Every structure is written in C-alpha cells, then in structure tokens.
C-alpha cells in the first residue's frame, strides 16, 4: 500500500510501526495543501520546498503534527523521511487517479522526493555550534567562501537476499560499500546478499561541498575572535545554487565528517571533525534619518578618527564606500560599466597611508586588507586547485566591498591582474587547461611610495611615483601627499538608495569640462559622474543636484591640483 517505502526507510513495512502515524499526518498536510505546490516541478526536480511556518500554522491542516518543531529539531532524519514518503504517497495517489481516468476513456513510477523545509527558526549562529548539535536540525546564515565541483555520490545500494528474494536499499555511510549483516525481514537471516547496482534502489546523486563562514562584525566581535567556518554538503537539486561570495541561509542536519583532512603542518589536521548535511539553501542574489538631516564632513571625519589631515583623502574614501550606480539594464543586457570608484594615495612615508587603507577595510561591510611585500598571484587572483576548484582571492573576496593594497610599488606580476579587475570587474583565469572569468565587482583603494623619497620638487606625479601610466589612468581619484553607526549608514545606503544624475549637475560638469578643454583622458569625466552619484547615495538622495556636483568638482580639482605641477 506504500509504494516507495524502501526509497525512504531501510526497515520492512509494517502497519504496526509508529512511522505510519507521522506518515499519514504529513500525508493529510500535503493533501490539504496540494494546490499550493507545483506537482510537475516536484516530480522533475525530485524535491519539494515546504515553509516551516506552514507546518507550525496551527489549526486543522496541521492537526496531526502539533510537535513538528521538537520532532524536526531532535529527530530530523526520521521526520524528513516520513514527510518525503507522505508527499510521494500523495503524488502517486493523484497520478494513479489520473491514470485510471485516462485508462477508462496504472503503473505510476514517482521517483524519490526530497522533503526540504526552509525558513526554519530559531536561527543558530555558527559560534554556538558545539558537538552536542550532532543529530540535530539547525539553520545558519553566512557567506560562501569555497565551492567545490560536482561529483557523483552513491548514497544507497540495492542488495538482493538469496534466501527469501527480498531486495533492500542499504544506505552507505560516507559512500563506503558495505555489506548488510541481516535480511530486513524478521524471518530469515541469510546474511548473504548480491549487489544490484542497476536497480532503482541504488541511489546515486550529484554532490557538492561548500564552505560557509560566519557573519563576523569586523570591529565589535573582532576582539580576539576568529571567524568560524564549516562545511556543507549539497545534493541533487541543491547543487550549484550559490557562488563564492554570496550570503546564503542553509538549513540542515549536523553530522560527523570522516575523511580526514591534512596533513601537515603545524598543525591544522583534525581527526575529530564536523560538517553540515544541507537540507535546504536560500541564496539572496531612525538614527540613519537623523544622520541624513554637515553630513558629508561628519562621515568623512569619522572614517579614520586617528588620521590627522587628509580631508580630501577621507572625502574620496566616503565616496568610494557608498559608490555610484551599478547601472546594469537587466532587460537590455547593457553593462553597468563601473559604479565603484578607485582611490590612489601618493605620499611619503610617515603620512599614515597604511592607516587609511585599514580604515577603508574596517568601516566597509566587506573589507579586505593586503600588504604589498608578501605577495602571491593566488593572493589576489582566483586560485586553481585540482585533484578542480577555484578559490576566491583578495580581488574576489572584496566583491561588493573595498580592497586595500598597501605598498603596491613592491608588487610584481602578482599585482597586474588588479588592473583587469578595476576595469572589467572580473578576474581572468587560464591555468592547467582551465579557462574562465570570475566576478570581481570591487573598489580598489591603494597607496604607494615615491621614487626618490621626498618629492617636493619640479617633477609631476607620473614621474615621482613608482608606477606607470597603465594604472594611473585607471584611478578615479589620485591624492598627492607630501564607527558602527556610519557602518550601518553606508550599508543602508548601498541597499536602499540608487542614485541618478540630474541636468543641473551635468551643466556644472559641462562648463568645467569646456573650460578645461579651452586650455589646449575620458575616464576623468566618468569619475565625475561616479563620484557625484556616490554623493547622492551618501545624502540618501535618488537624484544628485548641482550642489553635489560642485563638491565633486572641487574634490577633482584638488586631485588635478596635486597633479600637473
């Protein structure tokens, strides 16, 4: 009466077992809510997404499941199996009725349906995950760092008993081919089984291993605490649902990892080891109003409270933190060019250029700080690791954020891919026959030292700075030198306000550009717009006026004043 019983439970079917009660409970729940889901998509993908708020709705549809929360948290592998068998029974009953109606005017083979529950609460942070969570169902939310490749994984294996002819679906622990020790029927214990690898009970699915790092407060919770990470295993439809850098919410069971990695030294090898079996994954991709109502100078001076002077440098840093408009026409595939401006700090030692890059990475919600001596090509570009996987580098880790590069005059070919990232918002990969293009929508702020030390002489910027024109033409702002509340304000502005350029702001830029032409790169004008739009996002305004443009022009005037000397 239960077709597919062996697809979820390895036990022998018995109407006296306590499984029937929960199975019929979830079957009632699914029959009452059969119109809420797409049966075709459930059959094709082999899974079903159920809202946890629907199970805890309370009433009549959930009458036979009053303790769904406790049973799911403490016994997930049993509750999910019962739920999957119930939805499979509902689908096969509906399809058998349809097939009978078709025959009147009956072998329906419904495959395995993964019962996936999303939007689970309470949310459990990774730092509070200990060993006692083993066998429990919890939900986490974090940023993806590593995404491995898709690989086949044999979950179950079919075994035919030579005594009674019964075929069982024995699950494998970590994929280890083990032989059953007794026949599942309580009659004969033949203890001799033949493997049936072509049988439908032998379950083989796609498998992926992702790594999740906790959402760490870059200043509050950074008082000696390291960001904790954990491994998650996606299977079947959950495979290829997130890329490195996305913030995803993953609900699943906590299970023991047994490989074991390493080694060595000295020493990150751990025999003792944890991981998460992912059941569902969701990928997204007042004090503020007092601040909006001298806002520019207040945020500017509050970026680095330990750096004296550099008022224009802090002014460009705030503009880069908010950023312009990522004007990507998704309906026209019109590239957004770039809305993230770049900053160059040309200064002598002892000015605090490194401290400005630190504050750039600290106040930003996604900051990556890099020194310019211990440099590797894989430290900034994507890293290829084959047995292949692509590991995000500093130019990829800084996506939707700011990356700071100190002493880049000391970097060699490990730095030239940053030029391709500042312009294409992407990283080029070509190694070991693997060719790809990875995202890198980041804002690059950098600082360097002059050629002959103190350069208050008759030379200009392109001559005194240890840098060629291939990178000088890529910066929106060049400055020549010789916390949590503003963090929330910047994060809210990057998510809420999308700026535009008005006509009054353009007329000011037209007059300055025409007067600059009469004195006789194009990216200079692109900087005027990208910083003006950044000023509109700073003021939480959807449209930048002439006042914002004049301020951006004066900032660019200071950049062009230190230059062209």
């Amino acid at each position: 009466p239960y077709k597919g019983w062996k697809l979820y439970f390895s036990e022998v079917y018995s109407d006296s077992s306590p499984l029937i009660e929960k199975i019929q409970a979830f079957e009632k729940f699914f029959t009452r809510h059969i119109d809420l889901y797409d049966k075709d998509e459930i059959e094709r993908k082999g899974s079903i997404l159920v809202d946890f708020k629907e199970l805890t709705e309370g009433g009549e549809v959930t009458n036979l499941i009053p303790d769904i929360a406790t049973e799911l948290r403490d016994a997930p592998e049993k509750t999910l199996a019962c739920m999957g068998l119930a939805i499979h029974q509902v689908l096969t009953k509906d399809l058998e009725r349809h097939a009978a109606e078709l025959q009147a005017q009956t072998m329906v083979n419904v495959p395995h349906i993964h019962a996936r529950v999303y939007n689970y609460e309470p949310l459990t942070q990774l730092k509070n995950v200990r060993a006692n969570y083993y066998g429990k169902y919890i939900a986490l939310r974090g940023t993806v760092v590593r995404v491995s490749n898709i690989k086949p994984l044999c979950t179950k294996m079919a075994f035919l008993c030579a005594a009674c002819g019964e075929i069982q679906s024995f699950p494998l622990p970590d994929g280890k081919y083990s032989l059953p020790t007794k026949c599942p029927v309580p009659v004969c214990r033949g203890r001799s089984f033949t493997a049936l690898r072509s049988s439908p009970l032998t379950v083989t699915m796609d498998w992926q291993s992702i790594k999740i790092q906790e959402l760490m407060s870059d200043d509050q919770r950074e008082a000696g605490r390291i960001p904790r990470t954990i491994e998650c295993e996606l299977v079947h439809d959950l495979v290829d649902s997130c890329v490195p850098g996305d913030t995803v919410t993953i609900t699943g069971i906590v299970k023991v990892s047994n490989a074991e990695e390493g080694s060595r030294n000295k020493n990150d090898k751990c025999m003792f080891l944890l991981y998460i079996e992912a059941n569902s994954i969701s990928n997204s991709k007042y004090a503020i109003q007092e601040i909006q109502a001298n806002l520019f100078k207040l945020i500017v001076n509050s970026l680095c409270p330990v750096i004296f002077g550099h008022e224009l440098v802090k002014a460009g840093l705030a503009l880069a933190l908010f950023g312009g408009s990522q004007k990507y026409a998704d309906d026209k595939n019109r590239i957004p060019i770039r809305g993230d401006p770049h900053i160059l700090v040309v200064g002598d030692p002892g000015l605090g250029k490194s401290q400005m890059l630190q504050a750039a990475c600290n106040v930003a919600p996604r900051g990556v700080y890099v020194c310019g001596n211990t440099t590797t090509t894989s430290g900034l570009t994507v890293t290829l690791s084959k047995d292949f996987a692509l590991e995000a580098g500093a130019l990829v880790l800084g996506d939707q954020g700011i990356c700071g590069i100190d002493e880049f005059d000391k970097m060699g070919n490990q730095h030239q891919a940053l030029l391709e990232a500042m312009e294409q918002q992407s990283i080029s990969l070509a190694k070991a026959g693997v060719v790809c293009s990875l995202p890198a929508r980041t804002s690059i702020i950098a600082a360097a030292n002059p050629v002959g030390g103190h350069y208050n002489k008759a030379k200009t910027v392109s001559e005194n700075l240890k840098m060629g024109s291939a990178l000088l033409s890529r910066f929106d702002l060049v400055f020549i030198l010789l916390h949590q509340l503003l963090r929330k304000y910047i994060g809210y502005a990057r998510q809420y306000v999308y700026p535009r350029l008005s006509t009054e702001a353009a007329r000011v830029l037209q007059d300055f550009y025409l007067e600059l032409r009469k004195q006789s790169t194009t990216r200079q004008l692109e900087s005027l717009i990208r910083l003006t739009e950044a000023r509109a996002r700073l003021e939480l305004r959807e449209e930048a006026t002439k006042e914002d443009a004049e301020d951006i022009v004066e900032i660019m005037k200071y950049s062009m004043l230190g230059t062209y000397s």
Binding site: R228, S263, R264, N265, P349, G379
Partner: protein, 442 residues
C-alpha cells in the same frame, strides 16, 4: 580512594556548595541551552582550607576527585533548582564541570617550565605563551554495546592515553553475572544519543622573558575539552591548570612508536626588598639620578643626558585612555645620532642584556620580516611569527643602524611607534597585532 575518602570529599564539597557557590549555579540553570557544558570555577586554596583530607585526596587521585566534584555539582544544581518558587522558569543542566583554579602558590604545583616524567599523573599549573592553535572539532568519545543473552545496554569509554581508541570487551557488566562474551556494537547503527565531547589541541611554550626559563624554551601540547575550546588564540599568555598525562602509539609492522607528555586541561586563565625600600628612602632625587645613571652604563665616559634619557626609556611607561576610548601609550623612544664608534652601540646592547623582557637588532641586519610580522606557511596552514617590534611587547626594542633600513622597514616602525599595533596582511593571515613597546634607536 577508598569509601572513607570518597565519603569525606563528597560531604565537604556538598556542604561547601550548599553554603556558598549558589549564584553561579543559578546563572547556569538560567541559561537556555540544556545540552551545553557549563563550568564552575572554584578556588582550590579556600576549598583545601576547609578540610584537610580533601587536598590529600585531590593531589593523590585528581581524575576521580574531579568526577566526584561533577557529581556533587549536579546534585547541588538540582537542589538549587528545587528551591525556587518557579522551577519551570529555569532548566536543569547535566553537563557540569568543576574547574580548579587558584592552587596554593608553591614550586611543586605552580610551574614555569614544562612538566617532566616525574610529574605524570599530578594536577598542576603551567604558565606559558600560546604558539599554535588548532581548529574546533567534533567526534565520538563513548560507544554503546549490547549483550546477546540479557539484552543489557552498556557503554565503553575511549582511552585518552591511546588517542581515544576503543577496545572490545569480553565481559557483561550487567547487574546479573552473564557468561556471555558475544556483544554487538550500536554506535554506527543509529544516532540515539549525542555523546560527543569537544576537543582542541593547543601548543604552549616556556616564556624566555621569564627569569627561570633559560635560553632555549620547551614546548608542550595541551588538550582542551568541552567548554575549554575556543578560549584562547595564538600569542596569548596562559596559565593552564590540569593533569600531566602520557599519550602513546606502539610499534607495528612498519610503523614506529611515539610517546608524548601532554597536559589534559581543566581550567584556562588568560593573562632585598628591605634594601630597595632603603634605596627609595634615600632617593626621595638628584643624587639618585647620578647613581642610576652611573650604574646603568659605567663603561662610558660622560654622556649624562644619554644615561638619563635611557633611564626614562626603561622607566616609561603607563597606558591611558582618553574620552574617545583611544589607548594612549606609555613607552618611550630615544634616538642616538652619534658618530660610529662613540659607544652608543655599547649602551643599547648592555641595556638589552641587563633588562629582562628585552630585544635588540642592528638595522639592515633585520628587515621588516624580522621586525613586525611574518606569515609562516606550510600546506594550507599558517600562523603568525613575531618580530623585533612584537617580541618587545611590554618590553624594549633596540635598533642600531636605524637609518640603514629601507623605507618599508621604517614604515613598519612608523606604525609601531604611532599605534602600539602592527597590521598583519601576509598570505591568508590578516589581523591586528598589539605591539606595546618602547624603541631605543641609534
């Protein structure tokens, strides 16, 4: 311990926790997570002052005494829970660990060196610096088995001395004497219990800055379990209490043996007099300055100001905190722009050898890799190495040939002289490191 010893220990501890140590257990019961390991820190000196035999039995059998302490902690937690008007407002906690702290100050229990084979099996404290930390981990520690004749479910423990490996027994520990030797394992068949204890291996080293530690410090492995994990990081000054044990692996067909003395931790703590009083009375000041300055460096002619300035360098300083919460330094900085061979180098070297917790270098002989930070790597693993400006934290850093350095070695020194900190960003190691030090340059 016989029955009398266990009885007296239990009674003394039960009376002590029924009289005091109530708010700690109340706060433990008030927590939400019921499956969590909760520690109960107890001063060992005040506890051993209440009864004479408890200290003897603790120093004689530490593990069983700690087990009895945990049992009595559970009993006292239940008693305090039953004494509340609304017992349902809190929840009982079964994973209670008695963590010993504040041992009687003596050289036999408070150690500054790595314990030897003589101290195996004794409970003591070791003070050192953390040089290495491992990740936080999860895996099994007990395994359930069942008998084929009486269906009695018993449990076997993992041998800590054999790196938590299980050995199959051959006797039924049921209440009725079963002659059955056939047992079945139930560890991997199901997941009915969540019996798994936390585990972390840290590495501590003797502090060469101490007077008792010689030239070459020794290292030691410390095993933290349950709530003791995630309690320290690389570079911390720890005072670890615990039991010195031996973990070993024997010879095999192609494998060699390996024995190791480790420290199973129980609690973690993050860190002539009459003559001096008479010298201070005579100083209370110009004649005292002449004595200190002459005694600081007697191998030099004149240079009264340099001897005085060095005195202030070794003297200062004390940190402060302003209205913005910014740390305001204390440590001094003296520059000696002297002609070569005038003896300025003779100052700094003798001053670095005369002072405990002191470092030195000779400029270009140690670049920024030897002054600040270095990301020591090996496979996909790395740690933080300390330089001259870091090892001198709460100490002195001397740098001869100070202008012979590169502009990037000076930039690193610029940060250490301006923030008490050094920014780390090498390879995959990004952090903010405290370098509260004074710098005596020439």
């Amino acid at each position: 311990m016989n029955s009398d010893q266990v009885t007296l220990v239990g009674q003394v501890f039960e009376s002590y926790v029924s009289e005091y140590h109530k708010n700690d257990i109340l706060l433990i019961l008030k927590e939400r997570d019921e499956d969590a390991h909760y520690p109960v820190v107890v001063n060992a000196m005040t506890l051993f002052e209440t009864n004479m035999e408890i200290g003897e039995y603790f120093n004689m059998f530490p593990s069983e005494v700690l087990t009895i302490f945990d049992s009595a902690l559970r009993r006292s937690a239940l008693t305090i829970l039953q004494s509340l008007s609304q017992p349902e407002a809190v929840s009982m906690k079964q994973n209670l660990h008695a963590r010993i702290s504040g041992l009687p100050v003596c050289p036999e229990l408070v150690r500054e060196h790595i314990p030897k084979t003589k101290d195996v099996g004794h409970f003591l404290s070791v003070t050192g610096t953390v040089i290495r930390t491992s990740l936080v981990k999860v895996l099994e520690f007990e395994r359930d088995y069942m008998c084929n004749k009486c269906k009695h479910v018993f449990v076997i423990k993992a041998d800590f001395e054999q790196y938590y490996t299980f050995c199959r027994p051959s006797s039924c520990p049921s209440l009725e004497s079963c002659d059955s030797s056939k047992f079945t394992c139930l560890s991997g068949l199901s997941s009915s219990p969540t019996r798994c204890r936390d585990y972390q291996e840290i590495k501590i080293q003797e502090q060469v800055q101490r007077l008792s530690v010689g030239s070459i410090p020794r290292s030691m492995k410390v095993i933290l379990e349950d709530d003791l994990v995630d309690s320290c990081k690389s570079g911390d000054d720890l005072t670890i209490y615990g039991i010195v044990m031996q973990r070993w692996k024997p010879f095999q067909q192609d494998v060699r043996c390996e024995v190791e003395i480790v420290l199973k931790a129980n609690y973690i703590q993050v860190n002539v007099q009459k003559e001096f009083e008479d010298f201070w009375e005579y100083y209370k000041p110009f004649a005292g300055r002449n004595v200190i300055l002459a005694s600081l460096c007697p191998q030099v002619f004149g240079m009264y100001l340099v001897k005085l300035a060095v005195a202030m360098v070794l003297a200062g300083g004390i940190q402060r905190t302003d209205a913005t919460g910014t740390r305001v330094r204390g440590e001094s900085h003296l520059l000696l722009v002297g002609d070569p061979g005038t003896g300025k180098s003779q100052f700094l070297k003798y001053a670095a050898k005369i002072t405990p917790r002191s470092v030195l270098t000779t400029g270009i002989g140690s670049t920024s890799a030897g002054l600040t930070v270095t990301a020591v790597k090996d496979s996909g693993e790395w740690n933080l190495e300390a330089g001259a400006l870091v090892l001198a934290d709460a100490g002195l850093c001397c740098i001869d040939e100070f202008n012979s350095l590169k502009e990037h070695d000076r930039t690193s020194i610029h940060e250490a002289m301006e923030q008490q900190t050094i920014s780390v960003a090498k390879a995959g190691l990004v952090c903010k490191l405290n370098t509260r030090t004074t710098i005596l340059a020439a």
